[PDB]
Design a protein around this ligand. Sequence first.
Ligand SMILES: C[C@@H]1O/C(=N\OC(=O)Nc2ccccc2)[C@@H](O)[C@H](O)[C@@H]1O
Ligand SMILES: C[C@@H]1O/C(=N\OC(=O)Nc2ccccc2)[C@@H](O)[C@H](O)[C@@H]1O
Lengths: 438, 437
Amino acid sequence: IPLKYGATNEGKRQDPAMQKFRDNRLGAFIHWGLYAIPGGEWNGKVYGGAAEWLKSWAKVPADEWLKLMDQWNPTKFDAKKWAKMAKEMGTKYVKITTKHHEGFCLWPSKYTKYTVANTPYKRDILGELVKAYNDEGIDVHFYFSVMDWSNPDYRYDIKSKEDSIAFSRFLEFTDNQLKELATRYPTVKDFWFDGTWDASVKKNGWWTAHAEQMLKELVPGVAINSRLRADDKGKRHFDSNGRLMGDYESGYERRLPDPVKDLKVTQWDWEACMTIPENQWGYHKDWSLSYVKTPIEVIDRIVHAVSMGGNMVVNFGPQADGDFRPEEKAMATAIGKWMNRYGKAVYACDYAGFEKQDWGYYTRGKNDEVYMVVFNQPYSERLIVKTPKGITVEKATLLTTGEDITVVETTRNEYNVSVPKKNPGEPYVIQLKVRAAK
Amino acid sequence: IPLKYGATNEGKRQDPAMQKFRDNRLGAFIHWGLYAIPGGEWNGKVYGGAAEWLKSWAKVPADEWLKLMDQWNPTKFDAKKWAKMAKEMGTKYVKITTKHHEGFCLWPSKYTKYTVANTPYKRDILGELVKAYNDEGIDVHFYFSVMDWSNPDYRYDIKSKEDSIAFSRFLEFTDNQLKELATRYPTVKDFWFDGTWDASVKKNGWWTAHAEQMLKELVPGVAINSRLRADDKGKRHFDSNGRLMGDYESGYERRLPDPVKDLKVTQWDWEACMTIPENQWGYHKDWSLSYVKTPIEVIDRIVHAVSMGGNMVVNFGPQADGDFRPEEKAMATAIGKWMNRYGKAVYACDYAGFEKQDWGYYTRGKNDEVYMVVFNQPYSERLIVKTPKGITVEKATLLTTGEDITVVETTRNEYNVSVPKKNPGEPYVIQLKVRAA
Ligand SMILES: C[C@@H]1O/C(=N\OC(=O)Nc2ccccc2)[C@@H](O)[C@H](O)[C@@H]1O
Ligand SMILES: C[C@@H]1O/C(=N\OC(=O)Nc2ccccc2)[C@@H](O)[C@H](O)[C@@H]1O
């Protein structure tokens, strides 16, 4: 099908900027906005829904919601501390909410009064974060919500002549903010779009293709996520020729691809994001309301992503005062101790092409290292490895100690790899040397 | 498709005899015959192939092979010590080679001279084992090879009038031995046929249906394996309508059914068999030539079978002297030590209807117990349980202790059934209380 506004990449991008986005592998997400103030409570009622949607849950008028700017004073905010927290965690990039659905900008936009500038704190939070993260060697990605609850020219659908004209004004406004972010903060490496699912955006595929090109023209090598993009026909993420639009698929949140049934995902770049609670992105005061993931449950999902050729981003919702809740400091600390030991099987790794086994995941390094990441320790003391046609295992090594690991052939294309003599007592890595028959 | 010699069961038999066959779940195989004497070596060459096929590997003439009878003298043999070893192991049934391809009979058959009777030992080994196993409360099943290298009336195909005349004589001989086993040893619970794959048997489907019928008449509630059976069109195991013949499917000697892709096996009774080495059933003197399974690799396979509504039989190949090699005594000892702790999860258990998880297998007790048989201990300290649509986990208990196990709900239809407060330190069992509505 001829499309003017469909996909622009033939397979994965291999330019250095995309290779860096991919090699980074582990990200953090920051959700910070006016929603951190009520933290899921409005007018004495606590709402179970995602805190950053509280304006919706509590049916708050825009005027009353955005009045929260008068209370915005994150006195314990310290962009250097935040960047050290991310660096200690082992995050290679941070994705920041520049503007959520609420419409409150974390940078002093000249296109709205609903920004950091018009609060008691006054400071350009986005700018302080970009510089602090960048000083730590950490890449910065901008989340941006097209849907904007603060602009009455937004429309969910086009059902009239006045909807058409208002939505045209809305797209001009959106272009102004996007160009302003690209120009103010040229170290930006990615635009992660949200609030682009409505019938209104679907009917403006041309506009989604325009925003992608506009930002690519302003920011050499910038990445753009698939959630932005609709084609000529208003088909999202993948065009009507089934090709991926944008630079990477960003449709995975809180259910990762099946390691046996979804090997299709290894054909394109992709990024999963995840919450620590079941479904809280912004600060919610009461994490007793849903299940809260442990560090290992989070590390399992990071390795799972990389094992299938994808990035993983772990969300944080900072407190209204500018500090991180205890649960989130414990998470970043725990992930960071594990990444310092075992990160060689995450950073710059990818799909290995081996059949999934029960003990954990395989990942593949740039020089054909095959890492076994063991999450489930067999009582048998043998890790089953089934090799693809023509692949043999020549050696196994415990990554953290360098100790040689016994490898025994059990049948054609199957080995037992021995567990370490001493139980590592957490998820661990055995590095395989393998050979391809010519 | 209209069939006279297709399936005789509609779904699973549920008479007490089949319920016993199924509840037993854990079997032992015994491969014992003349092949135990050479143990895979013939004229100074050790053959790497299955030792019970040595006659075929070394191309031994029947006359020369069957002369091994002259050396058959297992003076270390004691059926009571065999029946005790099987009892310690937690085996509920024993499948015994009455006659393997070589055609040497472990019972004094009237229809051939190639029997224990015509050896120095003289004694009815089969009858001795039947009594010893039965007195320890162990069911006894008869392996029987229709293909018989001792009888020149055997044919692989029927391509001449002489082929027809000879094979007809061979089927008469086969019926005689089958009738003789069923009458001499009426405690027999099952006949597990082998040597039935040749065009000669496939083209005589009527006969396979006759041997099943004849044995079911002589032995009330006897089981008959799928391997015997060919229908009217020569379709084996499953008839041309896709319906299982005999009382259970006998396969998965190479690989067990896949826990995700082959849930279809839960629809019929089935039994897997396995070797401890990669492919040795009869005694082979050199177990260094292939990989030898550890006890936990064997218990993994047993639990896998029951988790998919199947039986598992672990093979033993006794030495020519009538004793068992050190590796087989260690295996039997270890399987029993584990089965005494955790056997509630195996005996009289079946498919649980739960989505397979990485840490191990579900089995279902007769009263809706759900056992998590944990082989792969998560560092997370959380065992993921996705329940089917309309099931909840009310509690969890370390089977060996009484100790209660924290269940946490995580999403709709998912839990972190906690691991036991203390790590059972081997494949272990946590028991779940479920509830539907
Ligand atoms: C990154 C997160 O994502 C969102 N929305 O994304 C989706 O709705 N994703 C989605 C929905 C259905 C299927 C797949 C993805 C936001 O509304 C949320 O507040 C947060 O910023
Ligand atoms: C029980 C064992 O089984 C045999 N044959 O069985 C099979 O080959 N079984 C099989 C093969 C393919 C698919 C399913 C079952 C015999 O030749 C062997 O000596 C041993 O007695």
